[PDB]
Amino acid sequence: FFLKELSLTISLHPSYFGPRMQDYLKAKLLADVEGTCSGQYGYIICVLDSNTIDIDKGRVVPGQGFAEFEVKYRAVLWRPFRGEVVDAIVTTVNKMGFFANIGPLNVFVSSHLVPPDMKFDPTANPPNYSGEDQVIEKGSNVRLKIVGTRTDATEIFAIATMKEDYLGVL
Amino acid sequence: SGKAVAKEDRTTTPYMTKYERARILGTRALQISMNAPVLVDLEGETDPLQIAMKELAQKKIPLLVRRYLPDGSYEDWSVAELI
Amino acid sequence: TGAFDIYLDQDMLMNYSLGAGSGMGTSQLPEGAGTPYERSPMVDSG
Amino acid sequence: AKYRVFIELHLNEEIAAAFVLQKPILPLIYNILHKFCLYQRLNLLSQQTFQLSRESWLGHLRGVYDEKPPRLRLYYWP
Amino acid sequence: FEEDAAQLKLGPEFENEDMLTVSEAKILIETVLAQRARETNGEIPMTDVMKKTVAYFNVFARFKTAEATYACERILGNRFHKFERAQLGTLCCEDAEEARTLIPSLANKIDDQNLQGILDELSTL
């Protein structure tokens, strides 16, 4: 997680000039950036509105009637990178791997990237991957080491392994 | 490469230029024509421009003018400032 | 007439001629202008 | 009871706060005195305005006590 | 071009930025929400990203308190590597040998003894 400064342009419309534009610009910003994700900065958790909100500009458009208000803001973002170790929350367990979940990003732990001590049990009450006393079901945050990440359509997706020491059940 | 200039040490002419009047009135026209917050008691007009002119006369119209210098610097002027 | 750009004198719209703190006339939520005992920044700086 | 509680409390508390700094001191207290009671006058008068508006006689006449810093709008008949 | 793991490597801007803490991050989020509520009609959709975070954040409350965070801050100090810092305060436990394994970038960055002392303080916190 990071706290960084980002930019964003708000293109306002005459109808909302009034005498409290500042508010409108801020309201529009929160709505356009919060919840979004990019490969470059990742998930834009939320914007630290108030104090950390600059409103520069702006220059009205010639053939449009709309003015562009540049905005500098502080936000909390969640960008992952290959090699980072994170705690995740297992969601599903299929003979295909481990569908974990960290915050808002989805991490997939291919079965081939899981120790050979965790056999897959489909008969056991709730499909799990025990060994080896250690039992990893749909309720046991595991530790993984991102091996590779990808960014397809603003969205991000990477694969993690459990091959190193000090990884696995938490 | 801009540079911005001091709202206190302005160089250019205090009067509003032949061309500017023409651009401002052009600009607010479109604005109001686009349902916008009109800043002077509506005399009872119809023409998104003939109205803007009612504004100009009373210097009660938003919009400012950035006058780019050759340097690359600029100056900002307020319709109420100008002449 | 294209040798300049235009912006907006928000300043005028702001201070513009005149011219409060409640929150209980229906909106289950409360308020009180903005001084019920709460800060901000500081924590952020820490 | 409760008036003598919450009022006298913070009164004397910020009087002590006035001791914390270089002296005004008493005249501020003397200000807050007439301040509070006359505000109470403001809403006595307002409650009077609703003695007329909420009931007899007629309506339209009013004196609503706005949330703003205090004001009483004695708007009349149209 | 740049898709490594390191070892402290990757984007320059991101590297420059400081990795926010988990508990502290959640605290800040909470603070932000409180400031927004200050005059709300009621509702304010939290989308889907919020839900997830709300859960993960609570399921990782390494300092379920407004002071816990400050205590943690006090304990820390020396930057070293924003990332490493937030990482050490996000994992926890416990021995040196383990520290290097998780953060190989620590190689000859810091000693041991000290590390152990910090872990003990955290466990008690």
Q: What is the domain count for chain B?
A: 1
- Shortest alpha-carbon distance between residue C17 and chain D (Å): 18
CB atoms within 10 A of CB D12: 11
**Of residues D18, C37, E86, the one with CA closest to residue A3:** E86
Name the pairing type of β-strands A142-151 and A85-87: antiparallel
Residues whose CB falls within 8 Å of the CB of residue E24, separated by 6 or more in sequence, listed in order: E63, E69, E72, E73
CA distance D70 to D73: 10
Beta carbons of B76 and C7 less than 8 Å apart:
yes
E4: containing domain = 1-125
Task: Indicate the SS3 state at residue B52.
Answer: helix
B66: containing domain = 1-83
Q: What is the CATH number of the domain that holds E78?
A: 1.20.1250.40
CA dist list (Å): E51 to C26, E22, E37, E122: 28, 16, 18, 28
CA distance A135 to A168: 10
Q: What is the domain count for chain E?
A: 1
Q: Which residues pair with B65 in a beta bridge?
A: B77, C6
Query: By what technique were these coordinates determined?
Result: cryo-EM
Domains and CATH numbers, chain A: 1-81 (3.30.1490.120), 82-170 (2.40.50.140)
| CB distance A90 to A100 below 8 Å | yes
- Shortest alpha-carbon distance between residue C19 and chain E (Å): 21
**Of residues A27, A5, A2, the one with CA closest to residue A74:** A5
Task: Indicate the SS3 state at residue A160.
Answer: strand
Chain D interface includes C21 (CB < 8 A): yes
> Which of C29, C40, C46 comes nearest E42 by C-beta?
C29
Q: What is the CATH number of the domain that holds B3?
A: 3.90.940.10
CA distance E81 to E122: 19
Identify the residue among C27, C31, C43, C44 best suited for mutation to test binding to E, counting E beta carbons within 10 A and taking the highest: C43
Chain E residues at the A interface, defined by Cβ less than 8 Å, are 3-7, 10-11, 13-14, 17-22, 25, 28-29, 32, 35-36, 47-50, 52-53, 55-57, 59-60, 86-87, 90-91, 98, 101-102
CB atoms within 10 A of CB A69: 24
Chain C, nearest residue to E25 by Cα: C44
> Which of A2, A34, A82 comes nearest E19 by C-beta?
A2
CA distance B26 to B4: 26
Chain A interface includes B31 (CB < 8 A): yes
Beta carbons of B34 and A14 less than 8 Å apart:
yes
Q: What are phi and psi of A42, to 5 degrees?
A: 90, -150
Please state the three-class secondary structure of D8-76 as a single string: HHHHHHHHHHHHHCCCCCHHHHHHHHHHHHHHHHHHHHHHHHHHHHCCCCCCCCCCCECCCCCCECCCC
Chain C interface includes B64 (CB < 8 A): yes
| CB distance A86 to E86 below 8 Å | no
Measured between its terminal Cα atoms, the distance across chain C in Å is 52
User: Do E and B have ≥3 inter-chain CB pairs under 8 A?
Assistant: no
Residues of E whose CB is below 8 A from A86: 90
**b/e sequence D13-46, b meaning 16+ C-beta within 10 Å:** eeeeeeeeeeeeeeeeeeeeeeeeeeeeeeeeeb
Q: Which residues pair with B66 in a beta bridge?
A: B76, C5
- By residue count, chain C amounts to 46
Instruction: Locate A30 and state its tokens.
Output: 């929160």
Which subunits sit against C, judged by 3+ Cβ pairs under 8 A?
A: A, B, D, E
| CB distance A103 to A149 below 8 Å | no
Beta carbons of B23 and C6 less than 8 Å apart:
yes
**b/e sequence A114-140, b meaning 16+ C-beta within 10 Å:** beeebebbeeeeeebbbeeeebbbeeb
Beta carbons of A1 and E10 less than 8 Å apart:
no
| CB distance E7 to E104 below 8 Å | yes
Task: Indicate the SS3 state at residue B5.
Answer: coil
Q: Return the amino acid letter for E33.
A: L
Chain D interface includes C22 (CB < 8 A): yes
**b/e sequence C23-46, b meaning 16+ C-beta within 10 Å:** beeeeeeeeeeeeeeeeeeeebee
Which residue shows structure tokens 């991957």? A129
Instruction: Locate A48 and state its tokens.
Output: 């630290």
Work out the burial of residue E69: count CB atoms within 10 Å of its CB; fewer than 13 is exposed, 13-18 middle, 19 or more buried. buried
Q: Return the amino acid letter for E43.
A: E
